[PDB]
Enzyme design. Structure first.
Site, PDB file in Angstrom:
ATOM      1  N   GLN A  84      22.842 -52.431  21.237  1.00  0.00           N
ATOM      2  CA  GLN A  84      23.719 -52.498  22.434  1.00  0.00           C
ATOM      3  C   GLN A  84      24.453 -51.186  22.755  1.00  0.00           C
ATOM      4  OE1 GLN A  84      27.956 -54.620  21.162  1.00  0.00           O
ATOM      5  NE2 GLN A  84      26.201 -55.539  20.232  1.00  0.00           N
ATOM      6  N   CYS A 118      27.482 -57.656  23.261  1.00  0.00           N
ATOM      7  CA  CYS A 118      26.871 -58.478  22.187  1.00  0.00           C
ATOM      8  C   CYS A 118      26.477 -59.874  22.717  1.00  0.00           C
ATOM      9  CB  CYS A 118      27.872 -58.577  21.032  1.00  0.00           C
ATOM     10  SG  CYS A 118      29.480 -59.338  21.420  1.00  0.00           S
ATOM     11  N   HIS A 167      32.541 -61.141  17.792  1.00  0.00           N
ATOM     12  CA  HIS A 167      31.189 -60.605  17.938  1.00  0.00           C
ATOM     13  C   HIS A 167      30.213 -61.767  18.105  1.00  0.00           C
ATOM     14  CE1 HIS A 167      28.025 -57.711  17.671  1.00  0.00           C
ATOM     15  NE2 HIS A 167      27.611 -58.116  16.481  1.00  0.00           N
ATOM     16  N   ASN A 222      21.458 -59.053  14.360  1.00  0.00           N
ATOM     17  CA  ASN A 222      22.498 -58.359  15.074  1.00  0.00           C
ATOM     18  C   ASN A 222      21.846 -57.514  16.187  1.00  0.00           C
ATOM     19  OD1 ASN A 222      25.003 -57.321  15.705  1.00  0.00           O
ATOM     20  ND2 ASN A 222      25.434 -56.629  13.581  1.00  0.00           N
TER      21      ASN A 222
END
Ligand SMILES: *C(=N)CNC(=O)C1(NC(=O)c2ccc(Cl)cc2N)CCCCC1
Ligand SMILES: [Cl-]
Ligand SMILES: [K+]
Length: 215
Positions: free
Chosen positions: A19, A25, A162, A182
């Site tokens: 990102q 996120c 997150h 992630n």
């Protein structure tokens, strides 16, 4: 539900993305869950557009942050989301450039996992595919994860900051885990992934804000 499942092995999961400096996120989490459902429905996997989300989901705040559910609702009401190819990631919040003829997926709404319930999260992952989740990712110990099953008691399950994607779950040396994708690139964690403690009292808030799109 099975003892272990890994949707990367079933072709439901695209490569790890980065990102960058933008607080998008939520958009990556959202597209990861939409990518799983696409694969499950059509048999084809494609990268979907997080930029489409960052630019066009007006009830979110772009690079300032957002909710995944707002993104799913957007895709549903918009009648589509673009592919990454049709609408590439630039990492700042710009004007909406959605083109319906570049749509690569649709959404018929979304379901939320009962708050705090890791058994229900397990069942969702088993039966649906990858599920969007939010966590506390503020600790140095998370940021510098490299191996093993991550558990830190100072994680605050009530301090969600997150969003990531649960792509499976399992057990490593009697430490039950969640397999988490992630969006900090492939040079973060273990090739972009972290194993996070499962059934340790909802560690890091893993089951507090989980949802998935319906297709
Ligand atoms: C990801 N890089 C940053 N974290 C988030 O975006 C989360 N959402 C928010 O911070 C949030 C949600 C909704 C609005 Cl309108 C604004 C913001 N800043 C962190 C909380 C968990 C879900 C993602
Ligand atoms: Cl616009
Ligand atoms: K966890």
């Amino acid at each position: 539900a099975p003892d272990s499942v890994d949707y990367r092995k079933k072709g439901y999961v695209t490569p790890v993305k980065n990102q960058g400096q933008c607080g998008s996120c939520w958009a990556f989490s959202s597209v990861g869950a939409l990518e799983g459902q696409l694969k499950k429905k059509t048999g084809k996997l494609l990268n979907l557009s997080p930029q489409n989300l960052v630019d066009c989901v007006s009830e979110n705040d772009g690079c300032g942050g957002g909710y995944m559910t707002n993104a799913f609702q957007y895709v549903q009401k918009n009648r589509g989301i673009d592919s990454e190819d049709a609408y590439p990631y630039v990492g700042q919040e710009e004007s909406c450039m959605y083109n319906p003829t570049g749509k690569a997926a649709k959404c018929r709404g979304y379901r939320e996992i009962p708050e705090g319930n890791e058994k229900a999260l397990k069942r969702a992952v088993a039966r649906v595919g990858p599920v969007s989740v939010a966590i506390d990712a503020s600790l140095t110990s998370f940021q510098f994860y490299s191996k093993g099953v991550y558990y830190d008691e100072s994680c605050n399950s009530d301090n969600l900051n997150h969003a990531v994607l649960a792509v499976g779950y399992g057990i490593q040396k009697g430490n039950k885990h969640w397999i988490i994708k992630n969006s900090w690139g492939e040079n973060w964690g273990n090739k972009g992934y972290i194993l996070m403690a499962r059934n340790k009292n909802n560690a890091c808030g893993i089951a507090n804000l989980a949802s998935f799109p319906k297709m």
